[PDB]
Amino acid sequence: PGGVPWIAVGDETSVTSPGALRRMTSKDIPETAIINTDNSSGAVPSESALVPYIDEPLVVVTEHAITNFTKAEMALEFNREFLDKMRVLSVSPKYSDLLTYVDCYVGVSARQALNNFQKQVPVITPTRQTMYVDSIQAALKALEKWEIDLRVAQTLLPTNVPIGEVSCPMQSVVKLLDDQLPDDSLIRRYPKEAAVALAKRNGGIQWMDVSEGTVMNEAVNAVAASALAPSASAPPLEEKSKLTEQAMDLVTAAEPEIIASLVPVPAPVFAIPPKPADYNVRTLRIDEATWLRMIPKSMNTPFQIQVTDNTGTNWHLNLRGGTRVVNLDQIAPMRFVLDLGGKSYKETSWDPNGKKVGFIVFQSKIPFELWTAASQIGQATVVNYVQLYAEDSSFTAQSIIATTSLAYNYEPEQLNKTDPEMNYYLLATFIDSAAITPTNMTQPDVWDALLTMSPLSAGEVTVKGAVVSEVVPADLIGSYTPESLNTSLPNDAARCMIDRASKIAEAIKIDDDAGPDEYSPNSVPIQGQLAISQLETGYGVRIFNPKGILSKIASRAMQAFIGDPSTIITQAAPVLSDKNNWIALAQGVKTSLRTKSLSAGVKTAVSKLSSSESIQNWTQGFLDKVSAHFPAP
Amino acid sequence: PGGVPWIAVGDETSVTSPGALRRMTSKDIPETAIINTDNSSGAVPSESALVPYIDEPLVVVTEHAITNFTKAEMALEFNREFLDKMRVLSVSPKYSDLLTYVDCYVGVSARQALNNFQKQVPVITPTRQTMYVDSIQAALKALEKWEIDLRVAQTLLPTNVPIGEVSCPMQSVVKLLDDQLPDDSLIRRYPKEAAVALAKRNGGIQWMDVSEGTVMNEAVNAVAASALAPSASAPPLEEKSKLTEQAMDLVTAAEPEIIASLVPVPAPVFAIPPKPADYNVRTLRIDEATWLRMIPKSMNTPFQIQVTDNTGTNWHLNLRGGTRVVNLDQIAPMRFVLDLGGKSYKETSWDPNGKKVGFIVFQSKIPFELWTAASQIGQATVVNYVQLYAEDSSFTAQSIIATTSLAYNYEPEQLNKTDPEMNYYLLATFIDSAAITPTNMTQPDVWDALLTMSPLSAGEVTVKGAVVSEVVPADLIGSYTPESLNTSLPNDAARCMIDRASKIAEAIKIDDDAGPDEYSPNSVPIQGQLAISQLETGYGVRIFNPKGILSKIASRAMQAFIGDPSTIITQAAPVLSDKNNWIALAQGVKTSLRTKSLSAGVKTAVSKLSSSESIQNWTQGFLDKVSAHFPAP
Amino acid sequence: PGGVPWIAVGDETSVTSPGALRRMTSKDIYIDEPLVVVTEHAITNFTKAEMALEFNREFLDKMRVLSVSPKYSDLLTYVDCYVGVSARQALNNFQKQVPVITPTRQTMYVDSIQAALKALEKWEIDLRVAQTLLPTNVPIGEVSCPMQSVVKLLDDQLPDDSLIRRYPKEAAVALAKRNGGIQWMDVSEGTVMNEAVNAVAASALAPSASAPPLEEKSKLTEQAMDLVTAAEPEIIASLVPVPAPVFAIPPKPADYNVRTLRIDEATWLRMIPKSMNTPFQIQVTDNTGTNWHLNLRGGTRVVNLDQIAPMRFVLDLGGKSYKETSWDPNGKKVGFIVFQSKIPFELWTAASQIGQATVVNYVQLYAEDSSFTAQSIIATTSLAYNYEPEQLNKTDPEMNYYLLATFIDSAAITPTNMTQPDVWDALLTMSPLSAGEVTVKGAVVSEVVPADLIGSYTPESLNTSLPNDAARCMIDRASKIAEAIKIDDDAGPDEYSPNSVPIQGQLAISQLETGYGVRIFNPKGILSKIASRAMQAFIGDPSTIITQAAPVLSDKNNWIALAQGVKTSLRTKSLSAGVKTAVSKLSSSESIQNWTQGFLDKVSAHFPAP
Amino acid sequence: GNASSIVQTINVTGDGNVFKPSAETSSTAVPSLSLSPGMLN
Amino acid sequence: TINVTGDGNVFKPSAETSSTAVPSLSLSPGMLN
Amino acid sequence: TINVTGDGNVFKPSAETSSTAVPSLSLSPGMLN
Ligand SMILES: *C(=O)CCCCCCCCCCCCC
């Protein structure tokens, strides 16, 4: 069962009694004492002076542990000859020899030990059971190089084949290993021990016992090999059970309860780890990225302003229209890295070299659009900056900026949002100790560059550039236009949706194998969600279709889902727009896996069998190259 | 066993035919009917007026399932101290009570259950089974946040050590938890019970009985921790088997024979989920990709044209020498989205701003490269268009186009190409409501933009530009050039191939931990093939090298594969261009993997022990900080 | 037990008797073969394998196939002799009534099973179609729909070739054999009754109206434990040298433009002094000896091919201009040229200084026109060179190895004809060519300390790092840790979780210690909130731990405590899940139940019953 | 379906049949077996 | 007592003679109690 | 074992059957001693 051996002291109790049970210690069962452990392997000293003479608690060993800790013993016994050639572990531990079979109240707590009275439960002390696993694991240390030497003798030339049988004379193969194995091999040292170990684990190799001129099979793993061996009709049972489980594993990860939900779902539940993305603010369409603020252009307004940093030193810069900023608010803290490397920015009286540029944070009530003088910026600080180094490029006579790493990470809690009427913006442009003539420079800012944008929050996600606590998975299907996706954020629900539902696609392809324009058990839920989407009476000109047509539409549509899972989110997607399409398919993938029965596809298995023989044909072709160069007397 | 308890109809022992049996029913064995069930845990009501008196089918449980469901109950017992405070589930269900052992013919069909009699078969009714699984997982809902609280107390400070053991007085650490536990933690309301519950699941924590001042271990998981500890010479046991199968999961998923198969292999069994690919169209050597049909350079031919869109809304565009169009057939239904952001196109007489571009699809019998007039286009239409906006770039006195996402997905299943000579071509270029002057629109196309591609089908495999449902995955070894890959279609087999091969690559690294020239069990598969191949009469002068050389030369090639997979499909690789070695490489992996017996690399052991003790050294360092600033009275 | 049966010969009983035991063939119960001892686990599995077959018994006996059940337990044989694997271990192990079997009979059994499962390869597909075309399973509660309607639907969508169209009743009874939600009347008596057999198997796959089902709880914590184990949390948070063949991982390639780089940040470059007024012209041969003439000048850049951890370089020139007054890129050649000398590249002004030189590969360029009017553009180049220190076979420690890519032609180019000191102004891809070496900040190394990689990197150094650097391996393994947390953790913004409190403890004792600078006391709540925010920051981006000047992740002790507390946090779970997890899951499930009910209602109204 | 004058079968298209998909009856047959060879000995 | 380099020894790889030693064991601490 | 949406049920609210379970009890500290 499990738990701990419990002893009773209540003495007139049945169940739930206040003080019936007590722990059962090694004084109660002296057999579980460390003076009476069988000293086979000698792991406890025989000197009288060195035993603790103390008592330890006893614990219960279950069915699965005995059946497994004993199973570990074979890993030694597969290599038993090398052990005695090594004179370590003269006697196998035989785990069932260190237990004591008792009948008493058993259970993790006294409450449920109190009605659980079993018989012949195995019992052990922490120290005696500790001593056991030390005995085993020591041998694994001893066999450390044997195992490497044993394997390289097997993985040198092909010795297992997926199908059928190959052959090779012995004197050829023993001669082959002779010259190509490493000099320091333990095989060279003790060669006949290397002989015996193979036949124990490989039925193909067999050694003629000279006493009778006989030969037989020797492998101890005969039953297991069958479970891994093909029949000439279908793939082996082993992985047919395995290639299906991973699908059930991948689906479990996706949680189709969520990605089929029609209700608001808290962001931490829905969220997944994000990935870095890339943008270019200068070329980013203003209307698509709803998080960029831009002072209009063509007003003729032009001025300068001065803003210090954390160190208190002042700085001089310019401002004018066309300038783009990011609304730091409601962007779920980000990290900003902007490499100016690759741009020109050269101006008739102002080269960029030597100067410095940096990030600027702003704070005000007045919105960034109305900014036309110097006193409308409210609060300001310069949070980072770096210098510019310009080398020259292929493009003749024209210099270019070298790589830059202007880096900053917006954090709300530090910025301490308090006022609902606040406003926060980030700006990057040329900054200088001395002021700048407003016409020696012309660039509205330096956003004409490459920015990298990685999320910092985890359980909080944005949708269409706006952050929200709850999210409905369904309200995403077929609404993010191809433009709107590109202009979106990294930590976006759509991207958070693309990846999480992508794991479905991995699961579908490893299970199904439908070719072009024929159905599949995963193509069918769509195939059903259409006929009834069609038969009802509604707006438009109702279009009727045979099931032979209704079938293929889904059969293609399922293929399109695999190639680009992000197609479902595309607005005006061909077929996968409907939520009901997505729900029916997504729900059914779970079912189609639960109901499989060790089955391969009709297409798949034949190819594996056809492949398997070719490899068999390859091996025997190889095995003759041993014969032609290493003959036998 | 397993199945369903079958009964004999008619007479006793008259069973002779499968038609002489019947499924049992709780009428037949009234003990398993809910007016009798032991109502411990108080699940079924006690109103005699709310009880079905309706019989239900009987099902057989499996010996390997009772062990699982009993342990399900064991989860609660780690919290019974809180339960009885919470006053829930006063008597542990003890699943065994609900079972009843009757003996009969058992099976999942009357036929085979006929031949299968058994003695002492446990039975259960589905309704009763649901009650028990409820009885556990119902209470789990109660433990929801008592669970969270104590899992914090386990991990706020280090309570598990990788190796050895560490120490600190209780009276110190308690003052710290008092200093840091959130004020809403249940511990602050139930200290005593929280203290006991931890000591159940942590050997080191050991409270003292004030009645007679004894301290003993209270861990009930003394056996689970046994295989989680390390020895003094090797890593812990629990993980190696965990670690060793986990490589064996990648290989089977990678299906070694298929990716080392010489026979033809179909597409849908080989095709695997694809990846988006990016190309630039003008920059591509025309003689590289077959899917680029381009009208001969420096043609200098002027020819205007009227075309009609899907609504016939006329658009106008010109064609000239150097125009490049995609050979739309054999494209394996595909999704093109084009991204024009950044490029200028701003000529001296024809500005881009406020214009439209779009995809145009061409259909005619005449070969496209031979075009001179409008009678050779056949049938042509537009399929989508966008609008372009301008900005100003890093290079002064020239503008820059904003970002664009012109998109169109290609699918042949709708065009229904029915005549091979009928030719499908697609161009992207400027489109306008008015004919444009050739002298101004000198741009042959608009193909000077980054272009993204995603496959809309996972059953079509392309090789060398074209698509064929048959692939021989043996020949793809070392049969591509670096130029082939970047020009390769996004659904190219070698793209899919290295993805399948990537897991094989990964599975090795988990195993091997060797350095330069170091022969590994996963290196010698190549070494042998080098042994023969050197010695055979190949093209050129025969040159001989000794075994040690063939080791290291294979050794470099091994890692050169692991470092990067694209080297298996590379023209004139160091060794890998050999088709043969890739074959013998994979079949080494399985025998290597399946013959490991609970061991890791000799390097890994020495690293892990020295590393692990450093934490034990470090953890004590942390610990003794607490005793100082939280002194023991 | 498990192994092979054994038979004694001599009259010995003591353990470790030398020649006591010998194997037992079949004869010791024509063709005498050895015997093997089956286990309980294998017996259970193989019997369960048979139980799949009788899920389709009706269609089988309709199809006249496999008229008698395999009955695995029968093929066994019962003996009580010595059993084990090694004689010197079986000698102390003697069980009763062990199951034994010949290899051939066992093969015949498994082959019968395999070939049987072969036949039904299509019938199973048809049944899957039948159960999947409309929802025959629901997450929560129970839905329903009249049978006439659903049957009228199936005879309207299943393909004409489907076996159900020709074998109806067996298909129906098979369906009911695993779906308790479908039942068939018994007109003999007129009774409705569950017939599904996988009753208990489906209980664990069910919700409980308060908690999520058991299976996803167990499996999700399985994947968490799997990831944290495979991440090797001891090594990643170690404190001593670790050989790279242990630390290293499969790496990903990098993208570069050599001209864009900083010479001082990138430790793996040498440069010939700008404005040195030296322009010399030298000649090199190919692998076929043909001599190519090339010109060098100040402003040249190279790579220090020593201490590189053997790499593969491919260059790409597409998009670059390289047009010149009297030097058109079209028709020209470029190549990878290796330079081998003892002299530092900062000291090269003459010819014979260069030592030994070779070109390893060259290409021809092509020139088309681009978006900008009257400007020429180069094609896509893929010129490559995979480097190995074995071939060049370093002998003298003072010997140096430099790689360069520039123009080459078979005629002596006038230096004034062209001004580019090289063509490294080009997107460069760099892919590791070995998997058993690791570098640091462009320096090769053999024994890294995974700890001191914390906070040792600036961002521009991170972007200037080599692809096979220890930092990237640290990123990826900590990334696996990050997922492990995300699968486990669900605590939302500004909330403590059992995967953030180690940070809290490290900070709490850090505030109380004695070091450099003023003390800044804070109550415990702020500490906990901060630790939550920092852990979520790590989750957002794994690379941020190594970052210099990080808020919290800059501390090695924080990282160590986090990594170690992860293990206990997972291992101490007891079939538990978070609160918001369960609430949202249940709510979504009920929504889906409503969806399914509405859909099946649409069916019932669109397929009437008489 | 009834191929006989007297019917004693189960009228598939008859009345009285029940279709109540429930969570407790989530269908499955035999997805995977613990055919791991170490555990198979 | 065995002639590794003598004749009469059988080498014949069969799929049914597949080779395993002890890849892994299932030691999930939950399932060991 | 009862049919919620079946027939046979009756819904006849009355003065004499006005619902109440347990509003409040008289637990004065003086009363309880
Ligand atoms: C009975 O009258 C024989 C003809 C009717 C049999 C039912 C229709 C045949 C197919 C079975 C169910 C329909 C959906 C597959």
PDB file of C-alpha atoms and ligand atoms in Angstrom, chain C residues 151 154-155 158 164-165 168, chain D residues 1-2 12-13, ligand 1:
ATOM      1  CA  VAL C 151     -28.676   9.005 -37.822  1.00  0.00           C
ATOM      2  CA  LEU C 154     -24.761  10.268 -40.814  1.00  0.00           C
ATOM      3  CA  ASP C 155     -26.525   8.817 -43.821  1.00  0.00           C
ATOM      4  CA  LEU C 158     -20.339   9.669 -44.493  1.00  0.00           C
ATOM      5  CA  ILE C 164     -20.780   1.839 -41.967  1.00  0.00           C
ATOM      6  CA  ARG C 165     -22.957   2.052 -45.079  1.00  0.00           C
ATOM      7  CA  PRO C 168     -24.418  -0.866 -39.763  1.00  0.00           C
TER       8      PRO C 168
ATOM      9  CA  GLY D   1     -31.788  -3.074 -41.983  1.00  0.00           C
ATOM     10  CA  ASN D   2     -34.298  -5.706 -40.861  1.00  0.00           C
ATOM     11  CA  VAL D  12     -30.871   1.503 -35.299  1.00  0.00           C
ATOM     12  CA  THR D  13     -33.262   3.913 -37.003  1.00  0.00           C
TER      13      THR D  13
HETATM   14  C1  LIG G   1     -33.873  -1.378 -42.835  1.00  0.00           C
HETATM   15  O1  LIG G   1     -35.015  -1.043 -43.227  1.00  0.00           O
HETATM   16  C2  LIG G   1     -32.778  -1.577 -43.852  1.00  0.00           C
HETATM   17  C3  LIG G   1     -32.490  -0.270 -44.575  1.00  0.00           C
HETATM   18  C4  LIG G   1     -32.233   0.833 -43.556  1.00  0.00           C
HETATM   19  C5  LIG G   1     -30.911   0.603 -42.830  1.00  0.00           C
HETATM   20  C6  LIG G   1     -30.484   1.927 -42.227  1.00  0.00           C
HETATM   21  C7  LIG G   1     -29.769   2.808 -43.231  1.00  0.00           C
HETATM   22  C8  LIG G   1     -28.475   2.127 -43.641  1.00  0.00           C
HETATM   23  C9  LIG G   1     -27.216   2.631 -42.945  1.00  0.00           C
HETATM   24  C10 LIG G   1     -27.228   2.540 -41.427  1.00  0.00           C
HETATM   25  C11 LIG G   1     -27.588   3.874 -40.780  1.00  0.00           C
HETATM   26  C12 LIG G   1     -27.525   5.062 -41.741  1.00  0.00           C
HETATM   27  C13 LIG G   1     -26.271   5.891 -41.498  1.00  0.00           C
HETATM   28  C14 LIG G   1     -25.042   5.071 -41.845  1.00  0.00           C
END
